[PDB]
Design a protein around this ligand. Sequence first.
Ligand SMILES: [Fe+3]
Ligand SMILES: [Fe+3]
Ligand SMILES: [Fe+3]
Lengths: 392, 392, 515, 140, 132, 137, 168
Amino acid sequence: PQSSQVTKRGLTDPERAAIIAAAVPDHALDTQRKYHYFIQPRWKRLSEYEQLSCYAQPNPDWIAGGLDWGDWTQKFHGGRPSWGNESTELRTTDWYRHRDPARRWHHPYVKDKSEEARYTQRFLAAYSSEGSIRTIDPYWRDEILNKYFGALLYSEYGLFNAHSSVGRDCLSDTIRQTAVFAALDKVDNAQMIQMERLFIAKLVPGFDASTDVPKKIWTTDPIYSGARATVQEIWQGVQDWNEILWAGHAVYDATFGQFARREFFQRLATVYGDTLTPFFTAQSQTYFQTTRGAIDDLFVYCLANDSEFGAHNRTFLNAWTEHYLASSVAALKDFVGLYAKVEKVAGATDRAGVSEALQRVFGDWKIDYADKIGFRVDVDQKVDAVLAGYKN
Amino acid sequence: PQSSQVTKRGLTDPERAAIIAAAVPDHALDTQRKYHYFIQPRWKRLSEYEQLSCYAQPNPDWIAGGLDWGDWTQKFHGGRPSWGNESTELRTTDWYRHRDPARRWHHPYVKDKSEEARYTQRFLAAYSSEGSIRTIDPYWRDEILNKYFGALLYSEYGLFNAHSSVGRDCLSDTIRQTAVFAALDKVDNAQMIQMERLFIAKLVPGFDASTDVPKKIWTTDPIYSGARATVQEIWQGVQDWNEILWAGHAVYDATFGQFARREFFQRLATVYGDTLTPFFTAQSQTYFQTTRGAIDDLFVYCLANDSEFGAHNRTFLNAWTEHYLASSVAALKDFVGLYAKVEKVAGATDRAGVSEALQRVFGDWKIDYADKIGFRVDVDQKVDAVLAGYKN
Amino acid sequence: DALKVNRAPVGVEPQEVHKWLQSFNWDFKENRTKYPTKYHMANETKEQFKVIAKEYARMEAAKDERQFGTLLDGLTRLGAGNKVHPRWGETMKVISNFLEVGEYNAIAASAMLWDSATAAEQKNGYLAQVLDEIRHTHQCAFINHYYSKHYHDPAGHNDARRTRAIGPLWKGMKRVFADGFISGDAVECSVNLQLVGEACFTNPLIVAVTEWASANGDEITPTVFLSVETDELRHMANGYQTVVSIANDPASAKFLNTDLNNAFWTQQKYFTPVLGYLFEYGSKFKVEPWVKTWNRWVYEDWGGIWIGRLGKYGVESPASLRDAKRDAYWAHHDLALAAYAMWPLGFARLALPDEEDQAWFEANYPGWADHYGKIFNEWKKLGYEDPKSGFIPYQWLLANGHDVYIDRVSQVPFIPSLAKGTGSLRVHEFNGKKHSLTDDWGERQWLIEPERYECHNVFEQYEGRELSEVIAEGHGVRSDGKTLIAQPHTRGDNLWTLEDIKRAGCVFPDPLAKF
Amino acid sequence: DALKVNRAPVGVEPQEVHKWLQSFNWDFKENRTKYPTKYHMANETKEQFKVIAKEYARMEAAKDERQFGTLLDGLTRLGAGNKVHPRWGETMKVISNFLEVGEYNAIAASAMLWDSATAAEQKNGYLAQVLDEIRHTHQC
Amino acid sequence: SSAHNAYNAGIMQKTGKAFADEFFAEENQVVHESNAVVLVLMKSDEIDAIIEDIVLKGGKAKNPSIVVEDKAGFWWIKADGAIEIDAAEAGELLGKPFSVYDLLINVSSTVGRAYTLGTKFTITSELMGLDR
Amino acid sequence: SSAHNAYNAGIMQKTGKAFADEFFAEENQVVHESNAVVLVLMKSDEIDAIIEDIVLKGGKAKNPSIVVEDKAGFWWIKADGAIEIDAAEAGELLGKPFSVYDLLINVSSTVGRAYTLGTKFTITSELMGLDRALTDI
Amino acid sequence: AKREPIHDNSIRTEWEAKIAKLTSVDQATKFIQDFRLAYTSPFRKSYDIDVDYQYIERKIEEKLSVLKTEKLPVADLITKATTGEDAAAVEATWIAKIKAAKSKYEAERIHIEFRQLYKPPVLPVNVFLRTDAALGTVLMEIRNTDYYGTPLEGLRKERGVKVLHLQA
Ligand SMILES: [Fe+3]
Ligand SMILES: [Fe+3]
Ligand SMILES: [Fe+3]
């Protein structure tokens, strides 16, 4: 016997269920059963993704798209509004227009990453039981992978933190979800890189998975100087949340990050006999394309083509692209000095091989981003500029 | 208004819930709430795996371990029993002793494979979007991967079907689950190989993912002659269900299968710039190690060390091993003629590299299986026998 | 080498990665928070719940699968969505959607904490919280989404993200667990959102409420809300760590008690009356008196286990606590007068207390019958529920001198001539604008920080407008375009329409015109 | 080539793989059932529910998550397990455990059908059935 | 031990005027430090087994001040000092994989300082970082 | 036009001796070919939407012989000739991904010839492989 | 007396017509600054458009921003206020101003007036946000020094309210 009443459940207690049954009408009081039926659907039918996400942000009518009215109830000292137009240079007729093409609300998002979490541990338990690490090139394992792939976690980590002010400042619900899921994916990348290093340490005597050498390389090796300078700028040098998302994902990570993750570590793993790294880069590359889908919707579909502000927004996006492409080109020019440290493989690490990799990265970027905002770019000039850092 | 009664739920209908509440005793009628509490636990406490699986098979006491009594209610024409001791040469004091160390009942099994199913499609959607197929060696892709990795699906497929009589004939629940889960994993392997070929066909104009060339190679190329001969015997030449499981998983797939999947296709993919195949072999290799855990428990823990029949069973296991190792050595001797068709990479495809690969497979096998049943094997002799098929 | 390797099966556990996170940050000059803060103390704290991205997702997904299993399979097969007492299903329109904005603003608050944290582990911990508040936004949405599908009145469950903007109780909600969280000192969020909001008020708001739902036949909300609060363990732990940093630095500690007192008052000012009203008046079956719920969770357990224990380290019992306990006893009954009197501006159907409710109110709050009870009974006699009556109590209040004012700071309604809770009206003119303040704590906030508190109230926006016009314009109707979402009864017949409202001829005044 | 590729997002649907399953079988003299049967007719049929192993597991896992959510979360929180009339709760001791053996023997029966099928699609369909009867054994 | 940890302890036993009189007494206008902790467990198959076989046996034997109350959808637990649950002990009881992270799936609320250390979950009256 | 498809049609309306008399009538000691199909749908959020907005609207519009009965934990559906459910229509209705495989998650039983073809689930009285098609188109 | 509808009314429509006539960055900058001094903050000159000014301010912001992108060189969008001033100089000037403020009443008017004058699009967003944060820090610190030290009667006089009513 407990001090407090054991509450009878109205669903199952006969007396309360009978009282409830008498009170419930014999007919529905409206026929509109579509939750937030008034959302303008992006696709042929309203999605659960839209129903659960759209207009959760309580914006007033003086923030484009808001359905509320009046001033905020409490502002910052000085008068900065809870949310406001001063948070970004970009303008739109409706900040709610953005849609993640993956339609990720929280549940499909963690459902998918949970699959990856559990399968990863099963893969590692079997990979250690296979002994497949035995055929990896030791110099690649110890001198390139461990040290310079390790250092790359700091790029992923800085991009993750760049999202902290975006999570606070951005002006709509679907945008906030896009930004936060992108941030978790970035910090996941950094953790996954450290996880692979910690895993290799369990199989290779004398292999050191401390972050000490990676961090020294990230903070002082000229190979990462341009990259670290850019990440510091994107994360901590600006607060315009659209500038952060554009510079981070659509310029810096789409060029330097893609080259580092996909053209260097993932691709070179499959010439130096590394059967382990491809399992980890598969995850980061999948996240990149999912993130790109949403970033592309925000900046291309919505902002660069907003009926009233598209040209206006492209003016800013072009200025940002000019600045952060230079930074990323400088980052890549520094990074390609790393090829001087790798065994020469024809078509992969010689000048012709690096040139083709830079042509893929800059050519893809021209198609995926530059062309869509009207940013003119000479791909061969950007390739040639980076190759100036290549030691023949 | 429907023709039949709208049945009132006893859980929620006030009248029926009150009648049930009156009839339900005010105290439990026993305190033993552990489902099948009498199962002997393999680990510190009974697992849900054991509770749900153990003694589901209704064996009588004249099949070692059975808790029932008397003859079957209906037998085959002639008198073959529903299950019987005539189904295998091996003997035990209790057919129920086997435990899958992964403790897979149906739900965790499909839960895990569901993760892999969904993550695979996300990876492919992202991989096609990345364009990473662009750096694969074209000769490897078209002349080795497509044709000979394609052909390998028939090995996985025949091993899948070897389990059909095992699923009918084997003598306990935990063994039956192990066997069936092993079979689905093999046909999954064969399907995943085809899935990879169909995926490449969507990315490479002129790349033909028809099984016509793979099947022709499996059935007539001397490279697969020994392997196909072995799979045909294991699948359709015997019915002893322990012989099938042992020859299939612990001999043939542990030597030929491991070499082809892991040492040939997975390893050389990371020598020829193949960033796609490792994603698929990661699954087959995870499945192999999971299956091995369960196969190892059945034959080593239970059968080779059965308190009464361990030596008796090792006599058969040794004889089976002698025969199917000879088959698998011949299979491997035929298969290494495939190295004559690949671009020579030092330490991987030269005689020294192939030798070390054979030493891993035969050396690993001696530790994982031979040593555990007292099967004497000279690893260097088996390597030299296979290298007789290597074209210098 | 190439032949020999340890082939023991190993993976990498979450804590093995977590060990290295603190080293993921690096030093550079601009590596500091972008948000204004008074708090500049050392804050290299350790995370109490080691989580990495992969493990975060595994945990939450497992929580979800069980929750959605129960919702979409079991409870739907039981028809549980329409086994709810009408008063309670109407209450969940308000509770779930109002909490939703609290969850949504907590995303933003948590990002501020993430931005202002300096330790990589703390940034890692605040990201997990940011994701959780996203989960909670969608969970709250999912409740009303589910009710929209299975409950006998989907209107208002199905559109609160716009129809909430009509009514006055929504203004106060945008402060209590929204603007109050995100518009101010970022490091201070560990005091207002976490030490007060999460550690104090989510317990009655999210946990205790599940027992009221169950008593009234709602098994949907327990399934979701109890899952929501499982994430709160990490959030409270996050804030406590930063509070320890602040307590340990004398230069930061000199701000803590003031921020705590303001946070406590700001949140209780709205939470105490609004939730007490929703619990006691939006239920048929009552679990316990609201003031006992408040005493258990707020005063005794939160106040003793968090605040009383921290008193060993200079944290003071909030000076506003006495005023708060008066609110806990009477303020929700005061609020009920305003809620029932202004029912056409809401998006829920209300039920005057029946005879059994009235006896319950008077037994647990002696004096209720002679004050509030007499008023509700007179309104009923006047036709409160009857759409042909032409009677709306707000007009009746004005005709008897019972003016309704809105607090410029908290937006909470105040009827000084009928209130028994804490409050007294102060009306100031500043720079040609009149302002009504209702208590000593908000008045100080407004006097010191007038540019933070410029919120327009319903009377300023609707002045001189007829009630049915405001309601039509704000979409406060069912799909026939005529019948109001809001109702003064919970029966299926005799629903009010815009014409029924228009017949009463209710026009919004300027309550401060008389000063 | 090395620069130009279609980068449209594609995967491979289950029916795209299923199309090729019939070709997974190959001819050899001993490729015939091990069990006695009177029935020796041509039987190269197609399956009516196209499934491959990955899709099999996705479908069943989805079923399970909803079922076990209801049991372990909702119904347990309601105390539904002791809301049963004693007679019916007693009846389910028999119905569920007796059905369990029917499910368990259906595993073996389905394996026999798998063994005696000659079409790869039919063998694939009976394996899925074999797995289902394991599921049902564990469900009972 | 242990009536003071009941949900309806002390002033909560009183109703009507008697309750109001204590509620508004001068000495009750400031908070009073409590050495207690409150743990809320969401009812589920796993939690209910843990309540009956861990909290109410080894837990209450170790800490006899523990009080558990049935609150319809959750278990309300109050105790002096600390409450602890070892997920490794729970996994043995449940017969299935059960890390400390899985235990948290149905740990719904905490009034006190909560942390995990290894397989153990603890909520404590202690103020770590301030207490010695 | 559908009373014959009711769960309690015909002999099922009779009780006591009247039921026994027909049940044991000479002509009811052999089966009678029926052109019907029976589909059982496990009750769930998704299924209940499909019943209300597909089966009982467009479904019954195309096939007026459809009968749907509430059997507490499941829906019992009987119809002449065929019942069909397009998973693409259900996904449009539900607003979430919904292949034909997802539709089957709550398809509990079939009396008739059941198959999937694309996004559409069909149960039919037709004996595929035995019945010979009546058109070339 | 009688408010018009919330989101569509003659006050907003009339102001939108005024805004459409702006044709240069200089003109629209004086327009938005005059507007923000006249109609925003507790020190505004007039409450006559109280329920419309925030929407109207948005529309002026939009006109100024498009005019900036059509008419100004890209480098001006990054480094200059639309007053022509150097954005970095504006930042240092106003930070120094509030750090020299002798009371919370001086400091508050400096922060408020900075926003009235330089809120984007007048100042570049990145410069404005970090100046606003620096100003807000100083304002918060001075206001939260002895927050409860002045009685309400004294705060009312320091604020300069006309007290119209005190209950009981
Ligand atoms: Fe939350
Ligand atoms: Fe929270
Ligand atoms: Fe079955």
